[PDB]
C-alpha cells in the first residue's frame, strides 16, 4: 500500500538492496534514565494531548518580504543583543562599570564585546579580536591574548565578559572570563500536571537512500508507527532533500509540489489507522520551500476535517509545549557548525559535546553563531523577532550528522536521534517518555524519564 | 527610458540541456530570429539533427528554473563586502561595527568605506528577467502589425503553448511576489507627520 | 466598517496621512494621475470662467476618466477616495521644494476643493463642516435684526431685504480676507458678519489653504532623508517635467 | 564677529556651571528629533549615570538625522523658565567613529596648559 508512487515520478527508481539486505532491526544502540524493564506503548492519540506554540510573544504563523536587507538594521540587531545580554550579565554578577574599549588604563578593567577573529580562516588562539559594543566603545576592535588564561572556551559570535589590563587601550591581557547565565525554567500550571503518562516519536530526514526515491525508510517507519501506536510524532525534514542526485539534475518528471503533496498524503493515510498527532517541522534542504532562516512553515489545502485535529504544521524554529512539557526543535545541525568552529583550552579530559550544549544554552538564541556557515541565509529581522529561546526547555531536541547520543546538561535533556539513513544504510530513531513527576520534591524534577535510540 | 535589451543587459541568460540530445538551449526572448524567422524559443531545439521539441519539457524546466533561482537567492543572502579602496580590495563577510557617515568602517585600511558585492538591484532585476523572458503576451503586444501578430497566434501558439508558457512565467511570479524590493510603507514614509497621527 | 470610516465623504481636508503599505508602479500611476488632473484643473480655469456650465462639465468628465472621486454614490467609492487620498499625498511631498511650486500647487488644490463643495448638497455641507475640525458660531435674531440695515448695506450677496431665513456667522476680520479685501462684508469691533453662503465658501477655502501652506512648509523639513535609492528617479522627473 | 566656542563637557554643561550667553561646543549621541517644534535632544554616558542636552535647531534646517551617531553642537546657551537651558545651534555637525577618550584627553591637556601660562600673570 505504498500510496507514494516511485513509478509515477521517474521511470529511474531502482531500490538499494544493501537497505533491505539489514538484519539488525529494533535493536536498542543506546538509552538514558529509567529505561530498563519498561516497555514501549502508548494510547494511539486516544487520549488527552496538548499541543502549543511558545518563544516570541508572535509565533510564527504566515511569509514575510524577504529579498531586502540594509546594513544599519543588522548592526542595530547585532548591537541589542549584545547590550541587552551584557546587562543581563552585570546585573546578575553585580559589576560596577564598564571601562570602553581604547581608554588606557594602568589598573585591572571590565569590559563587554563580542569575540571575533580578524581574518577570513577558522579561529585560533593568536587571532582574537574583541568588537565592544556601540553605547560602550562605539564598537571599537582590540586584540585580546589568552596566554595568561587557565580556561576558556570561545566561538566567533559569543558575548562575553572579560576582565584584565589594558595599558596601552590597543591590546588586552585576559586574565578573567564568567561564565553565562541559563535562562530559568518554566513553571507547571494545573492543567500541566493533569496529563498521567504519554510518550513522543521522533525521526528526522532524509527519508531515502542516495539512489533510489522508493522512500523505503518513511513506509519501514509508518509501519512501526502503526505497530507502536504512540501518542504524539514529530517528523523533520528535508522530505524532497535538494542534495539528492536526481533532483540536482532535474531528471524528475513531476512537479515539486505535487510530489511533495503525494508524500504528505502517503503519509497521512499510513498513519490514520495508529491515530497519533502529527508535526512537520521544515528544513532549508527542501526543494520547493523558501531557503530563508527562519522558516515559515508548510503549506497543504487538500486536508480533510478529521485530519485537521491530528495534523499540525509548525514554524523553523519552534518552541512547542506538549502536556506542559517545553520542547525545543530545530532542524539545523548546530554541534557540526559549533564543533567546526570552535576553540578552547582545558586542563583535563572534557566532553566537547557538552560544551557546545552548555555554549548553545547560555547563549539565549538558537543560531549564537555569527558569521553564519557559508551555506546559511538569515533574515536578521525575522531571526531577531522569531528565534529567541523564551525559557530553557526541558527537553531539546536537535537532529546531527555526528554520532547520536542522549545527554543531561544544566538539567536540560538534548536528544540527537541522528539520520534516518546515511548514505545507502539505515540509521536511527528516537522515543521519549513523559511523566510528570511530583511537586513535593526539593527541587525541580526531569519530567523526561526514559529515551531510547532505536534502530530502523 | 530604458528599453528592455539595456534593462536586462547583465543579467544571466537562462540555460537548460535538452533531455533529449543533452545539448544546452541559450533562452534569451521569447522569439528566436529576426524577420522571417519567427519561431517560439520552446518549439525547436538547438541541434538540427535533435527532433524533441522543447515545449515537451515543461516540468524539467520549471524544476530548472526553481533551482537556479534558489541559486541565485542564496548568492545574494551570502552577503561578500569589497572594500571600496582600490589599493585594498579587502573582501570579507564580517560586517564591522564602527559604521561612518557614510557606511561601513574597512578595518584593513580605516580610509575606505564598504560595499556590498550583489546588491538587491541586481537580484531583483534577475528575477524580473526569468518572467520577462517567458510573458508570451506581452512579447505577441509588442508586435507592431497586428496581421503579422494574428499569423503568428494561428500557425504556432495555440492555446496550449499560452497555457505552458504562462506556467513558465508564473513559477517565477510566485517568487516575486514575496520581495521586499517592490513594496513601499507609507507610514515609515510620512512618520514626520503626527498632529493627525 | 473600516471602508467608509476611512473614506465618509467625498470632501477632504487631508489631514491623516496614509497608513498602508502599496506597490511602486500604484505610485508612480498616482503621482502622474493626480499631475495630470491638477494640470487640467488650471487649463479650464484658465480658458473658460469659474462657474457657468461647460467648465464644470468638462471638470466632471476629467474627474470621471481619472478614476477620481468627485460625486456621492452609496456604493463602491472606497477605491476613488482612497486613490484622490495617496495621490494627494504624494504630490505633496514631491511639491515642497520651491515657493513658486508651493503657491501653484496650493492654488490648484484650492480650485479643486471649491468645485466639489460647490457639487455639495446642504446636509452634506453641514455633515462635513461637523466631520471637520471647525467651529462657527451664530449670532442670535436679537443680534441679527440689530444690525440689519449695515449687513444689508453691504451686501454680501444679499439683495432686498433678505437677511430673512439666514443665519449671521461672526467670524475673526484675518480669515474672511478673501470678502474683506473689497468691501463685500460688514466689520465691527473686529468681526465680520457674513451670510451663510459665503461664509462657507470662503472661510472653508481660507482654513484649507492655511492649513496647507503649514503642513507643506512641515513637510519640506522630511526630504532631507529621503537618500532612498527608490523613488529618486520620480521625484527627480516630476519636479521639472 | 561671534564669540569663540569653548569647549565643555556634557556633564559640565548639565550641572549647571555655564553662565548664560555663554558660546560652548560640547558633544553627545542623538537620541530624537521633533520635528513639529525642532527640537534634538543629546546624552552622553558618563560613568553609570545620564546626562541630557537639549538643542534648539530652527537655524539648521533642512536635516538628516540619524539615531544613535555622535554630534558636535556650537552654539550659544539660553535658560528659559519651564525648559531648563537649551542650545541654539549655529553649527551641527556629525561625527561618527571619534575616539572620545583621546578627545577628553586633548581637551583636559589644553586647559591645563592654559592654567600653566596663565599662572605667570
Request: hydrophobic share 35%; aromatic share 10%; proline share 6%.
Amino acid at each position: 500500500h505504498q500510496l507514494l508512487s516511485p513509478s509515477s515520478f521517474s521511470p529511474s527508481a531502482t531500490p538499494s538492496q544493501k537497505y533491505n539486505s539489514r538484519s539488525n532491526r529494533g535493536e536498542v544502540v543506546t538509552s538514558f534514565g529509567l529505561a530498563q524493564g519498561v516497555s514501549w506503548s502508548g494510547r494511539g492519540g486516544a487520549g488527552n494531548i496538548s499541543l502549543k506554540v511558545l518563544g516570541c510573544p508572535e509565533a510564527l504563523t504566515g511569509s514575510y518580504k524577504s529579498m531586502f536587507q540594509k546594513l544599519p538594521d543588522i548592526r542595530e540587531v547585532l548591537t541589542c543583543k549584545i547590550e541587552e545580554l551584557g546587562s543581563e550579565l552585570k546585573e546578575h554578577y553585580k559589576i560596577e562599570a564598564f571601562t570602553p574599549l581604547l581608554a588606557p588604563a594602568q589598573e585591572p578593567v571590565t569590559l563587554l564585546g563580542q569575540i571575533g577573529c580578524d581574518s577570513n580562516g577558522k579561529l585560533n588562539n593568536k587571532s582574537v579580536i574583541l568588537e565592544g559594543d556601540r553605547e560602550h566603545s562605539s564598537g571599537a576592535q582590540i586584540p585580546v591574548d589568552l596566554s595568561e588564561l587557565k580556561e576558556y572556551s570561545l566561538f566567533p559570535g559569543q558575548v562575553v565578559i572579560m576582565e584584565g589590563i589594558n595599558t596601552t587601550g590597543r591590546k588586552l591581557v585576559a586574565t578573567k572570563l564568567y561564565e553565562g547565565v541559563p535562562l530559568p525554567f518554566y513553571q507547571p500550571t494545573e492543567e500541566d500536571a493533569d496529563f498521567e503518562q504519554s510518550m513522543v516519536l521522533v525521526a528526522c530526514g532524509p527519508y531515502t537512500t542516495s539512489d533510489s526515491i522508493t522512500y523505503d525508510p518513511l513506509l519501514d517507519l509508518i509501519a512501526v508507527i502503526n505497530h507502536d501506536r504512540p501518542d504524539v510524532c514529530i517528523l523533520f525534514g528535508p522530505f524532497l532533500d535538494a542534495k539528492h542526485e536526481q533532483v540536482e539534475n532535474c531528471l524528475l518528471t513531476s512537479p515539486f509540489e505535487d510530489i511533495f503533496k503525494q508524500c504528505l498524503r502517503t503519509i497521512i493515510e499510513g498513519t490514520r489507522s495508529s491515530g497519533s498527532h502529527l508535526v512537520f517541522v521544515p528544513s532549508l534542504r527542501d526543494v520547493h520551500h523558501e531557503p530563508v532562516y527562519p522558516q515559515p512553515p508548510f503549506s497543504y489545502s487538500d486536508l480533510s476535517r478529521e485530519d485537521k485535529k491530528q495534523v499540525q504544521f509548525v514554524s523553523e524554529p519552534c518552541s512547542l509545549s506538549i502536556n506542559g512539557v517545553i520542547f525545543g526543535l530545530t532542524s539545523t545541525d548546530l554541534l557540526f557548525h559549533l564543533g567546526a568552529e570552535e576553540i578552547s583550552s582545558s586542563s583535563g579530559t572534557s566532553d566537547r559535546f557538552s560544551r557546545i550544549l552548555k555554549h548553545i544554552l547560555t547563549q539565549r538564541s538558537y543560531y549564537p553563531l555569527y558569521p553564519p556557515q557559508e551555506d546559511m541565509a538569515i533574515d536578521y529581522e525575522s531571526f531577531y523577532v522569531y528565534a529567541q529561546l523564551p525559557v530553557t526547555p526541558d527537553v531539546l531536541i536537535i537532529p546531527s550528522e555526528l554520532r547520536y547520543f542522549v545527554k543531561d546538561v544544566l538539567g536540560c535533556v538534548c536528544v540527537n536521534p541522528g539520520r534516518l539513513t546515511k548514505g545507502q544504510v539505515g540509521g536511527t530513531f528516537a522515543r521519549l517518555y513523559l511523566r510528570r513527576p511530583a511537586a513535593d520534591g526539593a527541587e525541580r524534577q526531569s519530567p523526561c524519564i526514559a529515551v531510547q535510540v532505536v534502530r530502523i | 527610458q530604458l528599453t528592455d535589451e539595456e534593462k536586462y543587459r547583465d543579467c544571466e541568460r537562462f540555460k537548460c540541456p535538452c533531455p533529449t540530445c543533452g545539448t544546452e538551449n541559450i533562452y534569451d526572448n521569447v522569439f528566436d530570429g529576426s524577420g522571417t524567422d519567427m519561431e517560439p524559443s520552446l518549439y525547436r531545439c538547438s541541434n538540427i539533427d535533435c527532433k524533441a521539441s522543447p515545449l515537451t519539457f515543461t516540468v524539467q524546466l520549471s524544476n530548472k528554473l526553481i533551482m537556479d533561482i534558489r541559486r541565485f537567492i542564496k548568492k545574494y543572502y551570502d552577503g561578500w563586502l569589497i572594500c571600496e579602496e582600490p589599493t585594498c580590495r579587502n573582501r570579507t563577510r564580517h560586517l564591522p561595527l564602527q559604521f561612518s557617515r557614510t557606511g561601513p568602517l574597512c578595518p584593513a585600511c580605516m580610509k575606505a568605506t564598504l560595499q556590498p558585492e550583489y546588491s538587491d538591484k541586481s537580484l531583483y532585476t534577475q528575477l524580473c528577467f526569468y518572467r520577462y523572458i517567458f510573458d508570451a503576451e506581452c512579447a505577441l503586444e509588442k508586435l507592431t502589425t497586428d496581421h503579422e501578430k494574428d499569423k503568428l497566434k494561428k500557425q504556432f501558439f495555440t492555446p496550449k503553448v499560452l497555457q505552458d508558457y504562462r506556467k513558465l512565467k508564473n513559477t517565477a511570479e510566485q517568487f516575486l511576489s514575496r520581495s521586499g524590493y517592490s513594496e513601499v510603507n507609507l507610514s515609515k514614509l510620512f512618520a514626520g507627520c503626527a498632529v493627525k497621527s | 466598517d473600516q471602508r467608509n470610516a476611512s473614506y465618509p465623504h467625498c470632501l477632504q481636508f487631508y489631514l491623516q496621512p496614509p497608513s498602508e503599505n502599496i506597490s511602486l508602479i500604484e505610485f508612480e500611476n498616482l503621482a502622474i494621475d493626480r499631475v495630470k488632473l491638477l494640470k487640467s484643473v488650471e487649463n479650464l480655469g484658465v480658458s473658460y470662467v469659474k462657474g457657468t456650465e461647460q467648465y464644470q462639465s468638462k471638470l466632471e468628465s476629467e474627474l470621471r476618466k481619472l478614476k477620481f472621486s468627485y460625486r456621492e454614490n452609496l456604493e463602491d467609492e472606497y477605491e476613488p477616495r482612497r486613490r484622490d487620498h495617496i495621490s494627494h499625498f504624494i504630490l505633496r511631498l514631491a511639491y515642497c521644494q520651491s515657493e513658486e511650486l508651493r503657491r501653484w500647487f496650493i492654488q490648484q488644490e484650492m480650485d479643486l476643493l471649491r468645485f466639489r463643495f460647490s457639487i455639495l448638497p446642504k446636509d452634506k455641507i453641514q455633515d462635513f463642516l461637523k466631520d471637520s475640525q471647525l467651529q462657527f458660531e451664530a449670532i442670535s435674531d436679537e443680534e441679527k435684526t440689530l444690525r440689519e440695515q449695515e449687513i444689508v448695506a453691504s451686501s454680501p450677496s444679499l439683495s432686498g431685504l433678505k437677511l430673512g431665513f439666514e443665519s449671521i456667522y461672526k467670524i475673526p476680520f484675518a480669515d474672511a480676507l478673501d470678502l474683506f479685501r473689497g468691501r463685500k462684508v460688514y466689520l465691527e469691533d473686529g468681526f465680520a458678519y457674513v451670510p451663510l453662503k459665503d461664509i462657507v465658501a470662503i472661510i472653508l477655502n481660507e482654513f484649507r489653504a492655511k492649513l496647507s501652506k503649514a503642513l507643506a512648509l512641515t513637510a519640506r523639513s522630511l526630504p532631507a532623508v529621503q537618500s532612498d535609492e527608490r523613488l529618486q528617479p520620480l521625484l527627480n522627473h516630476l519636479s521639472h517635467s | 564677529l561671534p564669540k569663540p566656542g569653548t569647549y565643555y563637557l556634557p556633564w559640565e554643561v548639565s550641572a549647571g556651571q555655564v553662565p548664560d550667553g555663554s558660546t560652548l561646543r560640547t558633544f553627545g549621541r542623538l537620541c530624537l528629533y521633533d520635528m513639529i517644534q525642532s527640537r534634538v535632544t543629546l546624552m552622553a554616558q558618563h560613568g553609570s549615570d545620564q546626562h541630557q542636552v537639549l538643542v534648539c535647531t530652527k537655524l539648521v534646517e533642512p536635516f538628516h538625522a540619524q539615531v544613535g551617531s555622535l554630534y558636535i553642537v556650537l552654539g550659544e546657551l539660553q535658560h528659559q523658565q519651564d525648559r531648563g537651558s537649551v542650545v541654539k545651534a549655529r553649527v551641527l555637525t556629525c561625527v561618527e567613529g571619534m575616539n572620545l577618550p583621546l578627545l577628553e584627553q586633548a581637551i583636559r591637556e589644553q586647559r591645563l596648559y592654559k592654567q600653566e601660562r596663565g599662572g605667570s600673570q
